[PDB]
Ligand binder design. Structure first.
Ligand SMILES: [Zn+2]
Lengths: 98, 107, 302, 145, 393, 245, 191
């Protein structure tokens, strides 16, 4: 049995950490996401890969919104994505968004 | 060593609240580097304005103004001439250059 | 590997002996006194003619030729001395460069009227460059060199004494023999270790790394963070129900509306009152705060 | 923004990179051994990368939210979050020009087409085995030949 | 497992046990590393060092204590060594405490830091001669090879080309001819015809051998070795006999020795024990190979037992043996002395003459470092699954 | 003699002199004349060259970036340094590589000012170039840079390419919370839209929601009595739980 | 099936017919000997070496033999069909139906019902691009593969300029090979 709402996280990434004395975390794969595309329930995916995985500043917002019972806030930019952009900017790349 | 083990960052963690009003006022000097630049550097409104300052370039420069405090306090390097003049004399180099300059003078 | 091209580079050099660089020193020093002769010639003006220009310019080039000829002649000395301090700390080419710089300083400080071998002269500067460079750039955390003294002495007495007992020594024994406390040598044994890398595999298959397992005790807990703001909200809701004066006394006193604890006379200074007037209203306020109807909602907030 | 049209990639020019960074370091140091605090001009340099401790300058003279956007010119550190240290890029100016590798050792070498040169011949150029004529006048050779 | 342990110690129970069922001259497992290791000789030939008498002391704590107090279940180890000068002869005999040594229970177990751990048996192929025949798909004909592997050395393969003839590259150096191995081995081209001419496909090797002269082709052999080095009288025969007739770096298995005799129909009624490779076995597998690729069924040898000619199997049990734990720990003591002695012979020079006791030359530390090194971090040492007595069995 | 006329040098600054003193256009239409005239291994070379000369010819870029005079530095939290308990330090591999860079730049930087024979100069610049190369990608030119244990380090491309790649960082998938797993049995009295649920795991999952609801009716003072009261598993949570599910 | 989607050379090689007419059937050195006579006629087509283990194909009326009338693209022996040559001869529309019957047969052998239009969806990406046989007038490198709709959009601006006879055939290519030719560049980075 494993179960978790909120617990410890990694120091390298912001992902939940799972071991014996940890609550465990549930590893969500790839074909799973393919079937999520097959429904096309994309707001679920935006819920999954952002506020549940890597963006720290959203977790306080959605958690506190659940505390007050207010509206679900909009999922902000996955900051883990922007980490790749900084890696590209490390290697002589004028990358840019328009 | 796969076991649930904790390490440490360094620094501080604070749960302070956020706001965008009632902050301390400021003042802006625009320091000028050697390579013709103007860098709007915000300073706290109660502060001192120093003379030299390493800037966003990674170099130091002067102010927005033309005070020019001092181009001094630097020292010359310990050259090979000083290290020569420790163990050798002026007469040594004068007569020795009479020897060598004689040797090119006689070719 | 640039050792092939670099030994290949220095292999073109001919070896030199003592009596040559005796004269080459006169050529170089003739170059430097022709140099300062040129600078003082620029000081006083009155420029010498063309032959008395090309002779000093010629000998200024000549001291560079014999100088660089000597440096070429002792790159082989840099290799021959440096070539056994490998296997530890630093890449060999770095050792080449710092041996070159120490050899430059030894060239700058050499005398031939002392009558010695030039290499035996330079050996202090070369090995001293080894101690300096390996003192600097061999660790992730730079340790000052006086501690490196007892790193060398501690590894010496520790290794040789470890042979003397024939086994692992105890820290109180090193505290006895190296005449310190066991907490001293224990601190040094803490300092001596290299940092562990992050990217190696965990001993097995083979896909995961080490970075998956790092527990933060300085992590951002959510429930205290939400708890903190609503706590401040309960500070507002409870603290605004008391009197007009005591709100300003507690807020301006405790550093709440501004963030800084103040002296006694500072908040009495804006009111035009005494310190005792502040202390009796504040202390009586502390009697008001231990009224338990307020304390009931605030006890769990500890 | 969250209204993105494209995402275009080019070579980062030298001026833009030194428009990106907030400073240039010059020491091979991380921290002190004892107090474990970041050193000047090394790795983790607070002066160009920011506060490791939340809203606390290294001078330690200011701590509060009302002191924000300002610079302790004693510490040389702007007062802000610590999390932005995962965002600030640095740079190092060079003492000599340096070629990039992905145009050279990549197959085929776009450098080798780019000036119409052999790869193996270019290798001994950039690994410094031989000279090459880069520019010669034709006037003085021509008429004075 | 109990009789496997039993043997590095070499029990009296092991002595009679492996003495009544034949077993003429039983030698200890430690001894098996001793007499190949001892005597120790310097490069100058002026001093010498010897080992003798592996034995054991008593236990220091019972199993309930060791499992309780979380230690190793060990016992001391004594081996009586001797330094012997070669210039005058010296009798520095000194029984040296070689270190602690882990011990097996009557449960067949081991205790490391209180943890009960188990040694797993590791199946490996036996070294020896592996004959094989493959058929290509261009011209669909029959090439006949053999791969002969020793223990701890290089390899050699006697192949057959798609055309004529052979495949005789040793340690994978492109090809060799059979005759230059034999003529450069020091044999006439006449005896190539006499002993190996019936066997007529190799007459084409003696045709296209393209070099007449023993050393005149053996210099080209050394050109096949390096390439590009002026050969001397060293690299003519002695370097080759450092690969096949020096038993210090090229040492096939004792059973692999027995497997060579057993396959090749050698002088097998022999109590022999060695790891040296004669070339007579090499020409024997040459002629067995060509009698195979001429098409036969049987074969005898002058001086030995006749052999039915056949190909070999890959995964047959006679080709795939078991390294037991005493062979495992035997290898770990072997590498432990391989790392231990490799500074001792180095310090046979730089230590002071007449001022050395055998205690000053022995470092017992890397040995026990190799032991505790072995029981940690190996996938052959695992925890006992104690949740079912069946499971533990 | 004749050194007044030509210019010759070595390495990357001369390469920059090549790049600055180069034009696209007459080269380009020259290769247009080749693909009008030539054929075989006279046009195909102009083909393979004409693609990339055409590529610089199209966009408003320059080949200036192919050489560099400034090297950027990645933010430090992507090479973070962690101390464990007991004073056990761990960090990234890239940092001492940057240290080799800064030591060679300051080393050359001080060494030029004295002046030197050129044997030193191409040595130091060559070490600088290889330091840049090992910074970007270890093992591409010659022997790979290994450290302790004779094992190779992690360069920039190592963070990008391989089994830590863009699949293996992004599209590999990861673990998230508000989840769980257990073993399953049959529920044959249920309906299709129905399912069952083990209740300890359920209350373990729905913690912030029930923590909201239990305080709303006055069973609790705050979040802290809420969460602590959950950790005590007091019997007042259950009738709340059927409402919140 | 996995090879039949990347569409390599099948090991069960049997040629198909190339022209209508009759056949001249013979034996050869351990294989067979095959000659097709055209119907118009003209050049007679000869097939040399197909192993006698790979025996005849059955048509409908009962068995292939010598003197038999030859169709447009009838397969000659048992085995498997090359996609590229029946593409070269009969046309794309057929090769569609061919691959449908081939994969569809494989799922029919286990009796698993999969609707055809999914297979059609997989078909549609396989014939998107064409090659450059002739450069024509406009920058088209031969040996390259170019989208058909872009090729027809570039030939749509056929205002005079000198004519543009950029020639190309419809090109089948393997689905990995086809999947390399993208524009999105980070899916391309994902290999
Ligand atoms: Zn400060």
């Amino acid at each position: 049995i494993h179960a978790r709402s909120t617990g410890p996280y990694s120091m390298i990434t912001q992902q939940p950490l799972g071991g014996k004395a940890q609550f465990g975390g549930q590893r969500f794969g790839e074909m799973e996401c393919w079937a999520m595309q097959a429904y096309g329930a994309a707001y679920t995916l935006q819920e999954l890969l952002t506020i549940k995985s890597d963006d720290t500043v959203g977790r306080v917002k959605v958690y506190e919104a659940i505390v007050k019972g207010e509206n679900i806030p909009e999922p902000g930019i996955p900051e883990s994505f922007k980490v790749l952009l900084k890696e590209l900017q490390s290697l002589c790349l004028n990358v840019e968004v328009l | 060593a796969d076991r649930v083990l904790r390490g440490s960052r360094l620094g501080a963690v604070s749960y302070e609240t956020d706001r965008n009003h009632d902050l301390a006022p400021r003042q802006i000097a625009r320091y000028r580097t050697d390579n013709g630049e103007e860098f709007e550097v915000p300073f706290a409104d109660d502060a001192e304005i120093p003379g030299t300052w390493l800037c966003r370039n990674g170099m130091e420069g002067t102010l927005i103004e033309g005070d020019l405090p001092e181009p001094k306090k630097v020292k010359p390097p310990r050259t090979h001439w000083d290290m020569l003049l420790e163990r050798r004399s002026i007469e040594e180099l004068e007569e020795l250059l009479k020897e060598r300059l004689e040797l090119i003078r006689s070719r | 590997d640039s050792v092939r091209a670099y030994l290949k580079q220095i292999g073109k050099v001919a070896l030199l002996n003592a009596e040559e660089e005796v004269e080459l020193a006169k050529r170089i020093e003739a170059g430097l006194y022709a140099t300062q002769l040129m600078t003082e010639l620029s000081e006083r003006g009155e420029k010498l003619p063309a032959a008395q220009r090309r002779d000093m310019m010629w000998i200024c080039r000549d001291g560079d030729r014999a100088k660089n000829h000597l440096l070429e002649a002792n790159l082989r000395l840099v290799v021959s001395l440096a070539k056994r301090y490998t296997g530890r700390g630093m890449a060999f080419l770095d050792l080449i460069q710092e041996g070159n710089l120490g050899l430059i300083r030894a060239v700058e400080k050499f005398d031939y009227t002392k009558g010695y071998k030039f290499s035996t002269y330079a050996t202090w500067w070369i090995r001293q460059a080894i101690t300096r460079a390996m003192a600097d750039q061999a660790r992730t955390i730079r340790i000052p060199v006086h501690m490196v003294e007892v790193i060398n002495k501690l590894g010496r007495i520790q290794r040789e004494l470890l042979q003397d007992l024939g086994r692992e020594p105890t820290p109180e024994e090193l505290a006895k023999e190296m005449d310190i406390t066991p907490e001293k040598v224990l601190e040094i044994q803490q300092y001596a270790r290299e940092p562990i890398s992050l990217d190696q595999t965990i001993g097995d298959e083979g896909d995961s790394q080490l970075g998956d397992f790092i527990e933060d005790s300085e992590a951002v807990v959510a429930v205290d963070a939400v708890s903190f703001t609503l706590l401040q909200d309960q500070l507002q809701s409870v603290l605004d129900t008391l009197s007009e004066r005591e709100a300003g006394v507690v807020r301006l006193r405790f550093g709440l509306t501004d963030g800084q604890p103040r002296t006694l006379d500072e908040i009495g200074q804006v009111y035009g009152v005494t310190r005792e007037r502040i202390r009796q209203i504040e202390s009586k306020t502390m009697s008001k705060l231990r009224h338990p109807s307020r304390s009931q909602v605030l006890r769990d907030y500890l | 923004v969250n209204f993105f049209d494209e995402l275009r990639i080019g070579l980062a020019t030298a001026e833009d990179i030194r428009q990106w960074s907030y400073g240039e370091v010059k020491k091979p140091e991380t921290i002190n051994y004892r107090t474990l605090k970041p050193e000047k001009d090394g790795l983790f340099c607070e002066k160009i990368f920011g506060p490791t401790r939340d809203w606390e300058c290294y001078c330690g003279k200011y701590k509060r939210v009302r002191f924000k956007g300002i610079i302790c010119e004693r510490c040389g550190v702007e007062v802000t979050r610590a999390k932005v240290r995962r965002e600030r890029m640095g740079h190092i100016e060079l003492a000599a020009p340096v070629t990039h590798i992905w145009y050279f050792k990549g197959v085929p070498s776009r450098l080798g087409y780019l000036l119409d040169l052999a790869p193996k011949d270019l290798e001994k150029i950039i690994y410094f085995a031989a000279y090459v004529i880069t520019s010669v006048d034709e006037e003085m050779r021509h008429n004075e030949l | 497992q109990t009789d496997s342990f039993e043997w590095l110690i070499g029990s009296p129970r092991w002595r009679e046990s492996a003495a009544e069922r034949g077993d003429v001259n039983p030698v200890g497992g430690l001894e098996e590393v001793l007499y190949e290791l001892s005597p120790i000789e310097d490069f100058s030939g002026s001093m010498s060092l010897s080992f003798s008498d592996p034995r054991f002391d008593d236990v220091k704590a019972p199993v309930d204590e060791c499992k309780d107090k979380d230690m190793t279940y060990a016992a001391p180890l004594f081996v009586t060594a001797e330094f012997i000068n070669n210039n005058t002869g010296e009798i520095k005999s000194q029984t040296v405490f070689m270190g602690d040594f882990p011990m097996m229970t009557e449960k067949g177990t081991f205790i490391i830091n209180g943890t009960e751990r188990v040694v797993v048996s590791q199946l490996v192929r036996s070294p020896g001669v592996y004959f094989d025949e493959t058929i290509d798909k261009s011209t669909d004909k029959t090439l006949h090879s053999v791969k002969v592997i020793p223990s701890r050395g290089a390899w050699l393969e006697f192949d057959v080309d798609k055309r004529d003839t052979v495949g005789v590259r040793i340690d994978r150096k492109r090809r060799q001819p059979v005759t230059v191995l034999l003529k450069a081995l020091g044999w006439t081209s006449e005896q190539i015809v006499e002993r190996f001419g019936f066997s007529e496909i190799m007459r084409s090797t003696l045709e296209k051998d393209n070099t007449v002269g023993t050393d005149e082709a053996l210099l080209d052999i050394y050109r096949k070795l390096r390439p590009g080095e002026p050969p001397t009288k060293e690299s003519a025969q002695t370097l080759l006999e450092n690969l096949f007739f020096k038993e210090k770096r090229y040492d096939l298995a004792r059973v692999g020795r027995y497997k060579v005799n057993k396959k090749l129909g050698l002088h097998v009624g022999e109590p022999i024990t060695s790891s040296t490779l004669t070339e007579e076995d090499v020409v024997a597998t040459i002629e067995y190979l060509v009698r195979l690729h001429e098409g036969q069924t049987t074969m005898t040898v002058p001086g030995g037992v006749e052999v039915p000619v056949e190909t070999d199997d890959i995964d047959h049990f006679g080709n795939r043996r078991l390294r037991t734990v005493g062979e495992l720990i035997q290898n770990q003591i072997r590498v432990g002395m391989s790392r231990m002695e490799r500074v001792v012979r180095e310090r046979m020079t730089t230590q002071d003459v007449e001022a050395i006791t055998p205690q000053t030359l022995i470092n017992i530390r890397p040995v026990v470092a190799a032991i505790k090194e072995f029981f940690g971090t190996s996938q052959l040492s695992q925890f006992m699954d104690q949740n079912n007595p069946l499971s533990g069995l | 003699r004749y050194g007044e006329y030509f210019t010759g040098a070595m390495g990357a600054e001369s390469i920059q002199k090549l790049i600055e003193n180069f034009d696209i256009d007459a080269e380009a239409e020259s290769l247009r004349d080749v693909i009008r005239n030539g054929k075989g291994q006279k046009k195909l070379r102009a083909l393979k060259r004409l693609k990339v000369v055409a590529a610089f010819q199209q966009s408003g870029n320059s080949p200036m970036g192919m050489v560099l005079d400034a090297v950027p530095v990645i933010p430090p939290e992507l090479r973070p340094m962690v101390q464990l308990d007991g004073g056990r330090f761990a960090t990234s591999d890239l940092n001492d590589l940057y240290r080799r860079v800064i030591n060679r730049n300051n080393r050359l930087k001080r060494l030029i000012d004295l002046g030197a024979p050129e044997i030193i100069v191409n040595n130091e610049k060559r070490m600088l170039q290889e330091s840049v190369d090992a910074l970007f990608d270890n093992g591409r030119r010659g022997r790979p840079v290994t450290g302790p244990g004779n094992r190779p380090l992690k360069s920039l491309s190592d963070l990008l390419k391989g089994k830590q790649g863009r699949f293996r960082q992004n599209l590999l998938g990861k673990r998230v919370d508000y989840s769980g797993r257990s073993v399953i049995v049959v529920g044959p009295q249920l309906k299709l839209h129905q399912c069952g649920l083990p209740k300890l795991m359920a209350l373990e999952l729905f913690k912030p929601f029930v923590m909201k609801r239990l305080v709303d009716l006055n069973h609790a003072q705050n979040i802290k009595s809420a969460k602590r009261m959950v950790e005590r598993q007091r019997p007042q949570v259950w009738d709340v739980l059927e409402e919140v599910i | 099936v996995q090879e039949l989607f990347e569409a390599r050379v099948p090991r069960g090689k049997a040629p198909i017919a190339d022209v209508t007419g009759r056949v001249r059937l013979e034996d050869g050195e351990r294989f067979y000997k095959i000659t097709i006579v055209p119907d118009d006629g003209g050049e007679e087509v000869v097939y040399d070496k197909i192993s006698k283990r790979q025996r005849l194909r059955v048509f409908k009326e009962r068995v292939l033999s010598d003197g038999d009338h030859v169709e447009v693209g009838q397969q000659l022996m048992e085995g498997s069909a090359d996609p590229h040559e029946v593409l070269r001869v009969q046309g794309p529309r057929e090769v569609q139906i061919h691959l449908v019957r081939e994969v569809q047969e494989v799922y029919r052998a286990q009796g698993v019902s999969i609707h055809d239009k999914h297979i059609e969806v997989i078909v549609r990406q396989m014939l998107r691009r064409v090659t450059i046989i002739d450069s024509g007038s406009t920058e088209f490198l031969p040996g390259s593969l170019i989208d058909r709709a872009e090729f027809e959009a570039e030939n749509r601006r056929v205002v005079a300029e000198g004519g543009e006879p950029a020639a190309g055939r419809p090109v089948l290519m393997g689905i990995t090979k086809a999947s390399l030719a993208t524009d999105s560049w980070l899916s391309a980075a994902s290999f």
